[PDB]
């Protein structure tokens, strides 16, 4: 659910598209959508516009505010990209023609064998799940139902990788993929790790809170004393029970941890294991429908109902615990590499360590294939 519009400056005398002869747009990277809009304009308004190609939607916007063009095409998805460098962009423009588009995100891929991959996207925002934002949590869960093994692979938010789809396969921090959509994030990680991602789950701060509450909190073993959210929550060494708000702090704190983002990644993994322990309780399995009802409006997923039912009932009958292992893609922080989405800013990114990538890829394959980890 997105839209393309013809936009002009807020104070432009232009009121409707029939007054235009041309429009500036990135036909180099969004030609299909753009051409649909132009065909729709020619049909309902009998107006044929020539296109002044721009290198991107950001570039088109710059041209507009610079007075170098009268009108641009704007794909709503990319308004969120423009906002990264121009937070007040919305107030600078008006829209004089709008076309709604619709697309389903990733279709689910059913695995032909005992193993599947689920991508967990954690969005940096409160409120309705439909809110567009970057994906600061990017965890792949490789599950093998035969060996009863799970592998959690964390990819840091700042990982500098080719971003698929809207990212135009250009390098940027992984978290930006989330802005283009869950599709972009999924395809980005499929390409990086060379595996099919069967399903995804997408949730934000508000979704996470409801889930923890619903489950009655979660229990973890904390390895190092730390505090989160400017000292609001304190976590001692030892077994800790986390309510919704504590758990959210627990998975967010980074800077004060001995190993920074890597330790935060491990804390997130601890919480996932704890959630899984609650979700595979007999009470939870028996009452899965209530859990679906309770979380459906705040958590997006393409896992089919039929699949959930199979997974739940299989666990109900067979019982038995999954063993969980974890890993994280390693790299080196840098300030001198360009961000495709934010070309004018110096950003911190993590340049991937190639030897680590090889190891991470091999481990995913091992668990999928039922081989022991190195």
Burial class from Cβ neighbours inside 10 Å (0-12, 13-18, 19+) for residue 317 reads exposed
Q: How far is the CB of 283 from ligand 0K3 (least distance, A)?
A: 11
Q: Which of residues 315-334 bind ligand 0K3 (CB under 6 A)?
A: 315, 322
Among 8, 182, 203, 363, binds ligand 0K3 (CB under 6 A): 203
Cα(34)–Cα(161) distance, integer angstroms: 27
Residue nearest to ligand 0K3 (CB): 122
How many residues bind ligand 0K3 (CB under 6 A)? The answer is 28
Identified binder of ligand 0K3 from the candidate list 70, 149, 187, 252, rule CB under 6 A: 252
> Which residues in 334-363 contact ligand 0K3 (CB under 6 A)?
none
129 lines the binding site for ligand 0K3 (CB under 6 A) = no
Q: Name residues contacting ligand 0K3, limited to 92-121 (CB under 6 A).
A: 118, 120
Reading the block at residue 162, the tokens are 């080719």
Out of 19, 205, 219, 325, point to the residue binding ligand 0K3 (CB under 6 A): 205
**Residue 311 or 350 having the CB closest to ligand 0K3:** 311
- Choosing from 7, 60, 272, 368, the residue that interacts with ligand 0K3 (CB under 6 A) is 272
Residues contacting 158, CB < 8 A, separation 6+: 173, 174, 175, 261, 333, 348, 349, 350
Instruction: List CB contacts of 254: < 8 A, sequence separation 6 or more.
Output: 260, 261, 263, 264
- Cα–Cα distance for residue pair 363/325, rounded to 1 Å: 10
In the set 37, 311, 341, 349, which binds ligand 0K3 (CB under 6 A)? Answer: 311
Residues 6+ apart with CB under 8 A from 5: 73, 74, 76, 95, 96, 97, 98, 99
Chain positions contacting ligand 0K3, by CB under 6 A: 118, 120, 122-124, 136-137, 143, 201, 203-205, 208, 251-252, 268, 271-272, 275-276, 279-280, 285, 308, 311-312, 315, 322
């Amino acid at each position: 659910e997105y839209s393309l519009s013809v936009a002009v400056l807020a104070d432009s005398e232009i009121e409707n598209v029939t007054q235009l002869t041309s429009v500036t747009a990135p036909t180099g990277t969004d030609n299909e959508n753009i051409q649909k809009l132009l065909a729709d304009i020619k049909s309902s308004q009998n107006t044929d516009l020539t296109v002044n190609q721009s290198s991107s939607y950001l570039a088109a916007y710059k041209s507009l505010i610079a007075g170098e063009t009268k009108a641009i095409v704007l794909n709503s998805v990319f308004e969120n990209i423009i906002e990264l460098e121009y937070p007040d962009y919305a107030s600078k423009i008006k829209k004089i023609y709008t076309k709604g588009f619709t697309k389903k995100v990733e279709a689910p891929k059913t695995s032909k064998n005992q193993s599947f991959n689920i991508y967990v996207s954690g969005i940096d925002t409160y409120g309705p799940i439909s809110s567009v934002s970057r994906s600061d949590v990017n965890i792949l869960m490789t599950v093998n139902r035969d060996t009863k093994k799970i592998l959690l692979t964390t990819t840091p938010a700042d990982a500098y990788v080719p971003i698929a789809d809207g990212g135009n396969n250009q390098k940027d921090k992984l978290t930006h993929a989330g802005i283009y959509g869950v599709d972009s994030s999924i395809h980005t990680l499929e390409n990086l790790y060379g595996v099919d991602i069967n399903y995804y789950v997408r949730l934000n701060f508000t979704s996470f809170l409801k889930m923890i509450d619903l489950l009655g909190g979660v229990d973890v073993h904390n390895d190092q004393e730390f505090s989160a959210l400017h000292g609001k929550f304190h976590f001692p060494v030892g077994n800790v029970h986390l309510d919704s708000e504590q758990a959210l702090g627990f998975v967010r704190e980074r800077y004060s941890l001995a190993d920074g983002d890597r330790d935060r990644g491990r804390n997130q993994q601890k919480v996932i294991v704890a959630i899984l322990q609650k979700l595979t309780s007999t009470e939870a399995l028996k009452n899965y429908s209530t859990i679906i009802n309770s979380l459906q409006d705040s958590i997006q997923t393409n896992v089919p109902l039929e699949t959930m039912i199979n997974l739940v009932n299989a666990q109900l009958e067979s019982g038995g615990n999954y063993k969980v292992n974890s890993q994280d893609l390693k790299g080196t922080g840098r300030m001198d590499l360009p961000s495709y989405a934010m070309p004018d800013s110096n950003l911190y990114v993590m340049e991937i360590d190639d030897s680590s990538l090889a190891v991470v890829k091999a481990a995913i394959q091992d668990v999928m294939e039922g081989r022991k980890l190195a």
